[PDB]
Design goal:
homotetramer; alpha/beta; TIM Barrel; 15 helices; 10 strands; binds manganese (II) ion; isomerase(intramolecular oxidoreductase); tetrameric; D-xylose isomerase; EC 5.3.1.5
């Protein structure tokens, strides 16, 4: 272990501050003072803290109340040294957002949600956050006829392009990151996966400052490969932030500690974030943010334990993934399997489509039957990663 | 019923020609002669037939054999009147494609798969097909370390941009459509959903002639809303073709008759294809193609029955969805729920982001508590669609 | 279609009284007065009402308070004529229950939970209820090492046999119904499916008065077929009560209106409740109970609408399901497919194993390839079911 | 870690002999000679081999042929010393079996399938096998009206009790093990989970010699916890055999190498096979059998590698799992969390229901808010398990 601030472990206020109310029960923990949250996080080794507006400032707060709270909050940041790398807005708890924020059927709620966002953009800039996250949790429906699907996407576009144009207009040094979720709280949430998220950004006017904030558990709620999806975000140069946690299967969003869900996928998620790609290419250099929830069965000693464990898990995993790629038998296993070979272009420098068709040895005279003999040896290579992860090698 | 050629029911050769070998057993039906397939489809009311290259022409076929087969095939098209609207290539059965076609770790297989594609592009143009589909079924992995994820996407890009540039170079009146699948035959298939498919097309050089071919069962294998996904393809103006079928849940690709899977989703899938969007916008005007498989428990009388049923189901559904939107109580229910209200822009013509923030009634003086009272009445509206579908109204 | 008391439609107080509180937001509706719930449902068509101890009597209610509430509810019931066929205990909302009631790791908690069940049996008996339902929703774990799983079942058993022993001793005309759920609120719940519930019941000292309370959506959360699951419960004669609602996939417990999820599965569930088994066999006679939640987007008009919609859906399905088996064409299809042949014992009267292996026509000289030619025509029987469901027939 | 015959590792002939044929492609490897399978596994560390009647003896084999094959296999076995602990029947590949064997709608097919099972019992007994496994993979439907579900179970029962009756009559030292699977090849399979298998067994005339053969991947296909499922089988004393492999999610039956799926679930399965229950209870003693498939991308070096990898994974996990319970710190955590408190009966010796409801300290005066303060510290016990699994401890 021993996470140190250069590791860039940032934690949201709502993670450790999560009191335990689930769908079937009330909170099992007393509320957590934000100032207390800041001092405890800094003591554990974190680099920063993130928050939703209503996490710090009540929806009812008066102007006088908002400044009291921000003073104490800012003093704490000051006393401890934590940064505030990401800020986000609550567009899901208050009953007003029951049909969404940006894509609410009610036009007056669309405006109210957008004005909440713009003001929150001002606070984000004021705190020094470089990313503004957007989790559209109530954008969706339970029933397919509830919405005009085309208009729901035009209304989502309007909100995001209005917010973006405002960032550019003010010259805040902020980027927007969308956070996909397939379901919960809605039956079907719009932009349910990384692909949808990614595709949507490409139809925006201000797409240049809009990227994604994928969350392990969310892609895993659709049965998808999380590494595969973050790989694709990075390859598109849209992986602006990340939420790390654990999910055991397709069920409700569990938000477990990172590594307490699909352990082998967490191993390869850490290999991509730390090591990047076998043949070279992009790297993710932002914060390693944890969006989890301390199990409701545990008191406050598990709250700080769970926070410690996230960081532990990531450095345990980082350690084995460094050892793994550095190991000469793994590097040779990779060469046998064709990992480096995929890096070579298919076409020879200069060869046209007409050329290759017409190249007798690639088609006409190709021995297909002989190329099929090849042992890719992907099982042996999988076995080498598991043994490294198991601490055996 | 009574499907007529203007309905645009096109069927693949491999649907009705599917003999029954699954993972746990051999074929239960005798092979189906393609000429026989053409005459039977035309008799039933179809408009066209589609095929994979190896569906018609064996992988081993000599040049002399290829022309014999094409003569008889073309005479049949001629005798009956069917069009050939889409053509696709087999890059998954032969053992050579065990690690993929375009994204195979072996460079010699990448070339062989790409040269198979280019030649098949020539046949597609020769047959009069307007769409060339690409289902990347072996592109993926069972293990996360098997591939360099960034290089897998560069190699997928190369194949698609090489094929596209060839279409533009020859001036074929062809468009490429990608077909997403989350898994099977691979543990994880690249571009697993519509979003991923959509996002990927945006990184291509020749993205203008590349669109999607979503399949009901495939999105449903990730737990997604199929209408939601095709809505998004259409909104992006990338819904170039469609595969309709049935899937009961997250399991292996079942390929049931359209309507024998999630019936309520098929109702709204047909409402979007036929009716489009409540407030106006894009429409899909291509073929209604069926990518299904006759259950292996049934003989050839079920083969033609299953083919009849697909078309029946779609016209039964079309009928109720027309009645549904035309019904004045449904239109008023829609108005109560805010379906038309979502169509209005959030911002007043001319209002800037600064203006609305600063507009006291949208934020500062907004009564959130009062806007939350609103009864959206989405349950009543769902009940009106189910009763219309049930033939009750 | 109009519900009458003879339909045996029952509703829980928690269903129409569901305030809207979910994991990402607060109540969207005011609390429902029990008196008013009773009256309202009485005019809707309801047969009876069901409740949880704490739905009616607050956890901390004083004796005076308890008495008042009880006199008010009992008044209501007398006035409207509503029966109280099932009563259940809330062993999941209070923080004390965070690790379970019956299978909590803490022994004082387990005794409290059992005390709370015993007292509730008394109330259930004073109310005239025939069923006592146990939904062990906090019984399970998030983590695999948190429980001694053999010991979790012994503790489950101990509690259930203690509750059963007490019924028998007291002369109460009550049976216990266990209710499975695979996950949520815990990551994994003990006795997750109908299969697991039936199995556990056979290990009980008093399993004669312990049966199942299967819920539509719960079986669909592990992707199982509801209809197959209650068919095994019925066959074993352990289908004591039933919970009808809708679920649209493997995700959080949606609790939609019955028929508002998987429509074809709903139709076939109705077919099984109403027509029983094609070759005869046991038949379900209890209440048709709905455990659903009016979506939180709808106000109180929506609550009664949705309640109305449950009985409406069931009746519509029933009408279609009786039209389907009454249909001669459907009966022809049934004979062809071997539906009635299934009910014919495989052996002949007094034929042993030895006699069968020795019968030459049965094995040694059986023409397997010729038997494999049968066209089951299952596709066509399913098209006929769907056509009856759509009311196109 | 090196396997020895004392480890009881068993492998099926169909596993390492799996040729590569899947639903979208052909065999990628040549057929395996049985003789060679035997020899190879013998040098790997295997305890024994298992097979299906038709893995060894072709369906259409003449008597001369059958005898030859049997003499060759029996030779092999003698030469290498390999035991044959389980034998099973293939009632799924031939077209005759398309609607089931035991629960086919056609009555002559059901008699053939039962004849084929009886004859196979004989062979199983001549081979010295202790277990006779029934995997009813064609027993089920795609469509809900295709079967009389009460009648499907009676037919299942009839076949299983007939097979059991014959064992008893013959004096054979054999027990039957049923093997659940939720879907695939059929859309829905009868007796889909461990729960459903245990339930069915209690309705049998001869259930004393009928138990379960749970497969890791099969329970994970309905998203259930393997470890909880074999824990109920063990508790009921019905865990007769086990099939270990890996599955990475709710999708087609992957049949990966044991530990190559859900790693933490594998570790806890190993912990349960090796350490049994924390408070004591029954213990599994049979073979540790692997029913997996060498990925089709790998050639024959890959087949033996993957076989090797199964025993390798199990041993590595075992080493870690014995280190974990041996650890004092882990034992401390266990006591704190209430793992040993769970094993303590809830009632006191000879305390009745009445005595409990009447005990004031247990209910009336229990301090529920004070009991709710306990910090179970389940997160920390799970971090300790993971840290032992990673070998960082
Ligand atoms: Mn989450
Ligand atoms: Mn998140
Ligand atoms: Mn498909
Ligand atoms: Mn398709
Ligand atoms: Mn429920
Ligand atoms: Mn229920
Ligand atoms: Mn399997
Ligand atoms: Mn198996």
């Amino acid at each position: 272990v021993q996470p140190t601030p250069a590791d860039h472990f940032t934690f949201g206020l709502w993670t450790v501050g999560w009191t335990g109310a689930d769908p079937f029960g009330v909170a099992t923990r007393k509320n957590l003072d934000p100032v207390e949250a800041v001092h405890k996080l800094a003591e554990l080794g974190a680099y920063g803290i993130t928050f939703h507006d209503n996490d710090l400032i009540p929806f009812d707060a008066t102007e006088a109340e908002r400044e009291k709270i921000l003073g104490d909050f800012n003093q704490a940041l000051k006393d401890t040294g934590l940064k505030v790398p990401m800020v986000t807005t609550n567009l899901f708890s208050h009953p007003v957002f029951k049909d969404g924020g940006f894509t609410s059927n009610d036009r007056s709620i669309r405006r109210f949600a957008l004005a909440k966002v713009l003001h929150n953009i001002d606070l984000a800039a004021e705190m020094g956050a470089e990313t503004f996250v957007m989790w559209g949790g109530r954008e969706g429906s339970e029933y397919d006829g509830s919405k005009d699907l085309a208009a729901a996407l035009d209304r989502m576009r309007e909100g995001v392009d209005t917010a973006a144009g405002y960032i550019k207009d003010k010259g805040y040094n902020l980027r927007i990151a969308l956070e996909p979720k397939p379901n919960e709280p809605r039956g079907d949430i719009f932009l349910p996966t990384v692909g949808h998220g990614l595709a949507f950004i490409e139809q925006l006017e201000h797409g240049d400052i809009v990227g994604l904030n994928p969350e392990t558990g969310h892609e895993q709620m659709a049965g998808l490969n999380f590494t595969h999806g973050i790989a694709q975000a990075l390859w598109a140069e849209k992986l602006f932030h990340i939420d790390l946690n654990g999910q055991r299967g397709i069920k409700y969003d569990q938000d477990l500690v990172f590594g307490h869900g699909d352990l082998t996928s967490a191993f390869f998620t850490v290999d991509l974030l730390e090591n990047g790609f076998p043949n070279g290419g992009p790297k993710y250099t932002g914060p390693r943010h944890f969006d989890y929830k301390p199990s409701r069965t545990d008191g406050y000693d598990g709250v700080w334990d769970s926070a410690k464990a996230n960081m532990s898990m990531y450095l345990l995993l980082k350690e084995r993934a460094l050892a793994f790629r550095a190991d000469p038998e793994v590097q040779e296993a990779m060469k046998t399997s064709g990992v480096f070979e995929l890096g070579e272009t298919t076409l020879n420098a200069g060869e046209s489509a007409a050329d290759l068709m017409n190249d007798s040895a690639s088609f006409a005279g190709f021995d297909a039957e002989a190329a099929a003999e090849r042992n890719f040896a992907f099982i042996r290579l999988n076995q080498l990663a598991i043994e490294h992860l198991l601490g055996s090698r």
